[PDB]
């Protein structure tokens, strides 16, 4: 099964309403594993299975790093604002991470955003930064001049990130590697006169990845299908739905290697 490890950083200039100047959160798939902010000034585990396997002395080194990274972010956003001739509150974002796919192959990514829009995207294969505009182009040139940092990121993405991901997957196996099959139902109702609506509703499933489709006489529908988002139920499970307007219909649900058909 596909798994991912991700670290995000969010920087805000001139924050109001208790919003921290800096937040950093780590995830394994949908699950938060670590947190740091400019208020606590401390890196802490956000999952019981992280706290249970990593001694409090492990977070000591990460606290220092994050304080240093918090300072760099503040400086970088001040520089970005100057380049764009921008006043007031602006945000700077970073995402680093890797995926371990089902086939055993891997992906790595490193990107920045200014005001929630793509800014700089790392290319670990050509060892370069893709810039959206001229301000990003200026940053790109300064970063590309540092060959060492680039090779270090490629290594971290391809090697270190994967080794951490595998280690965290072992710690959180009872959560991350479990399967809770969906409970699926089909509801039929007459809506506007003549118009019949069919809804395929699934709930109580984990992992959140599910494929839900509507078919007509065993073949795919060329009519409009409505899709409900995969939503967290609040207990570690998810829910989703798919609807069609009936003019031999069946709902096809795939989840974790189990295919399920519900005919109307």
């Amino acid at each position, epitope marked *: 099964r596909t798994h991912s490890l991700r670290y995000f950083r969010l920087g805000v200039s001139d924050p109001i309403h208790g919003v921290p100047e800096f937040i950093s959160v780590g995830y394994v798939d949908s699950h938060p594993i670590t947190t740091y902010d400019s208020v606590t000034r401390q890196k802490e585990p956000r999952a019981p299975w992280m706290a249970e396997n990593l001694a409090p002395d*492990h977070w000591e080194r990460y606290t*220092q*790093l994050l*304080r*240093g990274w918090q*300072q*760099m972010f503040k400086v970088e956003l001040k520089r970005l604002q100057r380049h764009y001739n921008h006043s007031g509150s602006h945000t700077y974002q970073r995402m680093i991470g890797c995926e371990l796919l089902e086939d055993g192959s891997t992906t790595g990514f490193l990107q920045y955003a200014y005001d929630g829009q793509d800014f700089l995207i790392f290319n670990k294969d050509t060892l370069s930064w893709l810039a959206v505009d001229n301000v990003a182009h200026t940053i790109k040139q300064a970063w590309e001049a540092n060959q060492h940092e680039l*090779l270090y990121q*490629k290594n971290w993405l391809e090697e*270190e990130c994967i080794a951490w991901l595998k280690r965290f997957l072992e710690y959180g196996k009872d959560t991350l590697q479990r399967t809770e099959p969906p409970l699926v139902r089909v509801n039929r109702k007459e809506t506007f006169p003549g118009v019949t609506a069919l809804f395929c509703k699934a709930h109580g499933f984990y992992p959140p990845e599910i494929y839900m489709t509507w078919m007509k006489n065993g073949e795919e529908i060329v009519q409009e299908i409505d899709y409900g988002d995969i939503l967290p139920s609040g207990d570690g499970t998810y829910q989703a739905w798919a609807s069609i307007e009936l003019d031999l219909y069946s709902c096809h649900v795939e989840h974790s290697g189990v295919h399920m058909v519900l005919q109307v």
Partner: antibody, heavy 108, light 113 residues
């Protein structure tokens, strides 16, 4: 883990010397070579993180990730090359681990 | 680059000592190491950026102050003979460092009964 390098090495003036360094078995974020003359501060020579040979004048730094080792190759040895060579590596928690250093003696 | 004072010092057991270190390279990260025969440099304390400091491998008997972006002082409040050593201050642009670590000239400290 450990960073291991020979305590001392002796070679002849004009010849070639290879200083080996075996590093930590867990976590790797790069390897450095530093030069240190007797009574002086260490000075940076190189940083390696990916596989290969980086050449910088009479000095070359090699890294093998699979083999877990690095070497500092010194060519056409000079008396001025008499110094200690420090190997240092970055672990999975970005902590720098230092080797004890290899004292290099040049026979004129 | 990195200016470290003093180069030489003799202390009596119990005496206080401050080692000064300054860099004008606009570096964020500063470090204090000690060098002893037969072993690799050992980190006493470090400062990842201005406004933060933390213990290294050998913090006992020392304390530090990251006074501003430029300065990182090392204090021995009550000198002990085991503190006889060569002390190097260093700085790097950021932490983790993949570039050059810049060292001060060294401070040779002798603590005697």
């Amino acid at each position: 883990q450990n960073i291991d390098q020979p305590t001392e090495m002796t070679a002849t003036e004009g010849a070639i010397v290879q200083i080996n360094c075996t590093y930590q078995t867990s976590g790797f974020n790069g390897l450095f070579w530093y030069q240190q003359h007797a009574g002086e501060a260490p000075t940076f020579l190189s940083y390696n993180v990916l596989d290969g040979l980086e050449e910088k004048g009479r000095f070359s730094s090699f890294l093998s990730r699979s083999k877990g080792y690095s070497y500092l190759l010194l060519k056409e040895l000079q008396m001025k090359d008499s110094a200690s060579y420090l190997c240092a590596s970055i672990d999975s928690n970005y902590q720098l681990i230092w080797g004890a250093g290899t004292k290099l003696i040049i026979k004129p | 680059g990195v200016t470290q004072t003093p180069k030489f010092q003799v202390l009596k057991t119990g005496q206080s000592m401050t080692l000064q270190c300054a860099q004008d390279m606009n570096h964020n990260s500063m470090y204090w190491y000690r060098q002893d025969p037969g072993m690799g440099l050992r980190l006493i304390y470090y400062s990842a950026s201005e406004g933060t400091t933390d213990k290294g491998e050998v913090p006992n008997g020392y304390n530090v102050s990251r006074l501003n972006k430029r300065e990182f002082s090392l204090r021995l409040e009550s000198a002990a003979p085991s503190q006889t050593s060569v002390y190097f201050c260093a700085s790097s642009e950021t932490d983790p460092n993949t570039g050059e670590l810049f060292f001060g000239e060294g401070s040779r400290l002798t603590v005697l009964e």
